[PDB]
């Protein structure tokens, strides 16, 4: 679906950094697999992942966000879980 | 008499932590034992006669009472096999027998001494044993457990004194708390763990 | 060092003598 | 076997995976490019007539090897830095090198 | 290069010589000073505490760890049960010795002329407690010399340096057992210059 990444590097304008972020986002889809956020039309995860970054919604930057948001929201289930040995000892 | 059926007799402790030591392995094991917290002053009468050297806790089957925290946790992971708790090879089996020495010998001392020291040593301690307990953090990265992918008995040395940790005053400070707090999520929860503690040991985790 | 690998050496650099 | 089933399921393996034909002196960097293969039957490595003057690869014989990007990283720089049209301008000067032949 | 950070003298460093010399190790030792070797073993050793065993990657310093690990990785000759039933029995029997008798002669030695007596006579009713009992097997609880004797033979030898010795009771039974485990070469070549002048043997 993808045949060049000429227009997925002007929102990355360097060869070895679209390498990487795309290298790094094609995997959330593979493994602990959340959802790509294009319609895929029956692509890889590579070319889906090659695929957000040229829209814009997916760069080095907006990649941690969209996920340290995460790491602590899951600490806010760890301690709104925490209540659940809280109300379970006493 | 105590020991007349083919069952245990553990005259056990209900907060020293030989006992709870104990039935870790005691109970991890998946085996029907007798529990009764009993104290110092006053322990049950068969706790006296047939134990000539008066410990706790104090386990007892069919020939006679077996008394400390490492020959009775030994006696069981070595004739109660399933699951193991103790590694196969000499070489790193024996260490796993020097943790366990360089704990009741390296950090119980920091726990009797923060029971009867002074208003100094009971945070002197705590200086001695927070910021320690903070020079082992980057271990917990590589192995799931101290240094052992199965949940082997050293682990269980640590988890009875890391029970009492804000007991007797402590609170974790520093860089890298993640890595060890996160870990305590990973070992304080288990059916070896949850099922086998006092309730009466409980209470100070709120 | 040179390349897709000149990234992650510019953190491993970031790290020794420092934290 | 050869069962008929895997003849169906080969061919969603290699929806998207580039491959990596390259020749035996390789003199420079246009030497090795990727590919995004497609399946023939018969025992000969087909290659588009453009690109067969960056190899400098006559068709009397000469033969080519075929490697794989395995991992996840690595069958993206065979499409962004290796791939077979990033490579129109060669790098010891800015003269084409897909020049009509 | 298995070394051996041995005492010359202590009753400790000639536990771990018996195990070694039982079983057939090719050890070598290094000497401590008099119970203090180098400052150059705390690198190898946070405690400094003799004995202490290093073998290309270990480092052990216990009679407990440096005494088994020694049984569990030679195997044969065997110091110790088969079943789990009597381990405990062997593995607590010398729980035992090393916590009454071996502390108790501390003010023997490390004790004032006082407290010299309060160990010395106290304890000589107990040397011939189990004494009777030789009647039973050949060697303390086992037709077949093994890992819980290992705390005698260097504990026995010490007695005339020590003070405390036989008479009359006491002798019977009991000092059979010296004259039949003193001879072995594991005991017979275990024994050193230094620890040698506490007897005549
Ligand atoms: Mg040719």
């Keep these: ?24 986002r094609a995997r959330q889809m593979q493994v602990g697999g959340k959802d790509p956020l294009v319609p895929e039309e029956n692509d890889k995860t590579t070319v889906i992942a090659l695929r957000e970054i040229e829209e814009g919604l997916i760069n080095n930057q907006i990649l941690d966000v969209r996920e340290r948001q995460e790491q602590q929201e899951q600490e806010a289930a760890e301690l ?4 659940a040995i809280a109300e379970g000892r006493r | 008499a105590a020991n007349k059926r083919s069952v ?28 009764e917290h009993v104290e110092k002053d006053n322990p049950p009468q068969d706790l006296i006669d047939l134990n000539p050297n008066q410990s706790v806790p104090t386990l007892v089957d069919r020939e006679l009472t077996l008394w400390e925290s490492r020959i009775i946790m030994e006696y069981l992971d070595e004739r109660f096999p399933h699951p193991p708790l103790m590694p196969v090879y000499p070489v790193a089996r024996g260490e796993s027998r020097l943790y366990m020495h360089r704990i ?59 029970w009492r940790l804000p007991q007797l005053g402590i609170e974790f400070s520093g860089p890298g708390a993640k890595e060890l707090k996160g870990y305590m999520t990973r070992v304080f929860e288990r059916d070896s763990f949850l099922a086998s503690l006092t309730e009466a040991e409980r209470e100070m985790r709120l | 060092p040179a390349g897709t690998g000149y990234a992650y050496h510019q953190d491993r650099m970031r790290r020794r003598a420092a934290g | 076997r050869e069962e008929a089933v895997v003849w169906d399921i080969l061919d969603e393996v290699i929806r998207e995976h580039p491959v990596l034909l390259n020749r ?41 090897a075929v490697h794989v990007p395995l991992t996840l990283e690595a069958q993206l720089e065979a499409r962004a830095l290796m791939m077979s049209t990033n490579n129109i301008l060669s790098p010891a000067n800015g003269e084409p090198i897909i020049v009509p032949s």
């Design chain 2, 8 to 35: 245990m007799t553990l005259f056990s402790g209900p907060t020293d932590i030989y006992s709870h030591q104990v039935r870790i392995v005691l109970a991890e094991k998946g085996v029907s034992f007798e529990i």
């Design chain 1, 1 to 24: 679906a993808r045949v060049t990444v000429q227009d997925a590097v002007e929102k990355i304008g360097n060869r070895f950094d679209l390498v990487l972020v795309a290298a790094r």
């Design chain 2, 104 to 162: 009741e010998k390296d950090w119980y001392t920091l726990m009797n001494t923060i029971i009867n020291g002074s208003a100094s040593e009971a945070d002197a301690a705590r200086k001695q044993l927070r910021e320690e307990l903070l020079a082992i953090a980057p271990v917990f990265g590589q192995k799931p457990y101290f240094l052992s992918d199965e949940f082997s008995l050293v682990d269980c040395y640590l988890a009875p004194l890391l």
């Design chain 4, 24 to 64: 035996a002196p390789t003199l420079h960097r246009l030497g090795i490019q990727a590919f995004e293969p497609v399946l023939i039957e018969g025992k000969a490595i087909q290659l588009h007539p453009l690109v067969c003057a960056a190899y400098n690869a006559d068709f009397d014989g000469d033969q080519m």
């Design chain 1, 80 to 83: 709104q879980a925490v209540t």
